[PDB]
Design an enzyme around this catalytic site. Structure first.
Site, PDB file in Angstrom:
ATOM      1  N   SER A  36      38.558  12.742  29.222  1.00  0.00           N
ATOM      2  CA  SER A  36      37.331  13.414  28.781  1.00  0.00           C
ATOM      3  C   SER A  36      37.470  13.677  27.280  1.00  0.00           C
ATOM      4  O   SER A  36      37.601  12.691  26.538  1.00  0.00           O
ATOM      5  CB  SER A  36      37.004  14.579  29.722  1.00  0.00           C
ATOM      6  N   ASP A  82      29.775  10.291  37.076  1.00  0.00           N
ATOM      7  CA  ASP A  82      30.094  11.306  36.086  1.00  0.00           C
ATOM      8  C   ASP A  82      28.818  11.909  35.505  1.00  0.00           C
ATOM      9  O   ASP A  82      27.977  11.183  34.957  1.00  0.00           O
ATOM     10  CB  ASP A  82      30.923  10.636  34.986  1.00  0.00           C
ATOM     11  N   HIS A  84      33.624  13.021  37.502  1.00  0.00           N
ATOM     12  CA  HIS A  84      34.256  13.145  36.198  1.00  0.00           C
ATOM     13  C   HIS A  84      35.739  13.468  36.315  1.00  0.00           C
ATOM     14  O   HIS A  84      36.511  13.185  35.390  1.00  0.00           O
ATOM     15  CB  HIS A  84      33.562  14.260  35.419  1.00  0.00           C
TER      16      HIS A  84
END
Lengths: 258, 258
Positions: free
Chosen positions: A130, A176, A208
């Site tokens: 991320s 996601d 995610h």
């Protein structure tokens, strides 16, 4: 003969294994010992009889600690890599700062007493989840000598990666909603240079947070990418070219042959 | 507003120009007039309407004269700097001595009637070719108030530069066999502090002598570095972060954001 090949020839079983052929040990870098990052854990093969290994630094995302990426450390290192999972200076650091810290962590390895003689300091790579994956892209954008970059569900405000010269595997998660593939992962892939050795792998049905607990698809293709590009190991191209037939993969692109 | 910004907003064309936006004049410092160096030529902007300028001293390498780096003088000065290209006390002077002479040439400028009122003596930088670049690194280590250092194909027996606190751009030549990048330039870059603002730019296909005749890649990124760090000019960060895409660059690293 490739001098950087380590370990026996790979198979689907060997790249899917929770632990590869190299027994691993670990050492802790305290926040006080870390210059330019928040500390970390270094995982390394104890068998030095095949020579030095490439080095990999992995960053977590916003508000997250090493524990959110820890499983990747020994799973990758046991395939023949020195791997540092970092904490960031603060958990609120943004992607560009995470990229600076990934590079600082790699440079820490060059003088770290435990691993200085175990790494090939010329062969280094970055990964992250991320915002940490945005950091991996930033670190590659800032250092064309890095051998591989792997953003996992990467998030970054920066969408244009035309400056990257480092072979990059972009791993997206189909479902996601935090770093949606359309505006993050796929946008990153599309702006990497046409000529670059690169790939996009989308994980079917994944959220995610797929990278925050063990995921075999993530591990096996990260291992293949690191082997192919950190070690120039042509034995690992077979898993990436052509596209693997894998239900766990909902979309795939790659600039094969590499 | 940054009081040290000079000249029009930059473009690739402006930083690549043989002569930038500032008209230049020059004055000669004779060997007899030079205290602590072998004489030199000072190039300076004639436009005084924006205030004083930072100063830069440039050293040649072993056996070489001022004429081996002369082209850099007016090319950099025309971007808004007072630039002195030096001769050394003897052509056989070693790198540390070249560093002392670079600092002596900078300190000369405040005594020179032609340019003393055109400089900011608190904003100065050092550059040099081969042994002169080793001298630039020495001068930086030995003066933590210097604002920038740029070794071009630097040569030094000293490989550890961990005491440097001055933002440094290390320019290597890919095919250098005299100061090979693996044992000189890159060794210097890797030993500079992790936390220092720094960059390594390798010139594709270049020999050791790439700096001894006009080279646009060398000039444009030296100008951008001097602007960013001598002038704190944030308008020039765009050219340094992330890695530029120039074909003439075979490798680039920088500790972005600065």
């Amino acid at each position: 003969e490739n001098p950087y090949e380590r370990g026996p020839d790979p198979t689907e079983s060997s790249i899917e294994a929770v632990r590869g052929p190299f027994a691993v040990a670990q050492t802790t870098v305290s926040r006080l010992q870390a210059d330019g990052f928040g500390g970390g854990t270094i995982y390394y093969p104890t068998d030095t009889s095949q020579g030095t290994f490439g080095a990999v630094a992995i960053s977590p995302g916003f508000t997250a600690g090493q524990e959110s990426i820890a499983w990747l450390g020994p799973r990758i290192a046991s395939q023949g890599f020195v791997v540092i999972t970092i904490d960031t200076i603060t958990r609120l650091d943004q992607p560009d700062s995470r990229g600076r810290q990934l590079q600082a962590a790699l440079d820490h390895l060059r003088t770290n007493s435990v691993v200085r003689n175990r790494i090939d300091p010329n062969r280094m790579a970055v990964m992250g989840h991320s915002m940490g994956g945005g950091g991996a892209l930033s670190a590659a954008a800032n250092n064309t000598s890095l051998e591989a970059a792997i953003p996992l569900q990467g998030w970054h405000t920066r969408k244009n990666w035309s400056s990257v010269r480092t072979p990059t595997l972009v791993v997206g998660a189909q479902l996601d909603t935090i770093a949606p593939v359309s505006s993050h992962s796929e946008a990153f892939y599309n702006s990497l240079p046409s000529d670059l050795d690169k790939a996009y792998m989308e994980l079917r049905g994944a959220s995610h947070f797929v990278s925050n607990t063990p995921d075999t698809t993530t591990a096996k293709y990260s291992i293949a990418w690191l082997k192919r590009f950190v070690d120039n190991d042509l034995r690992y191209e077979q898993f990436l070219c052509p596209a693997p037939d894998d239900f766990a993969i909902s979309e795939y692109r790659a600039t094969c042959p590499f």
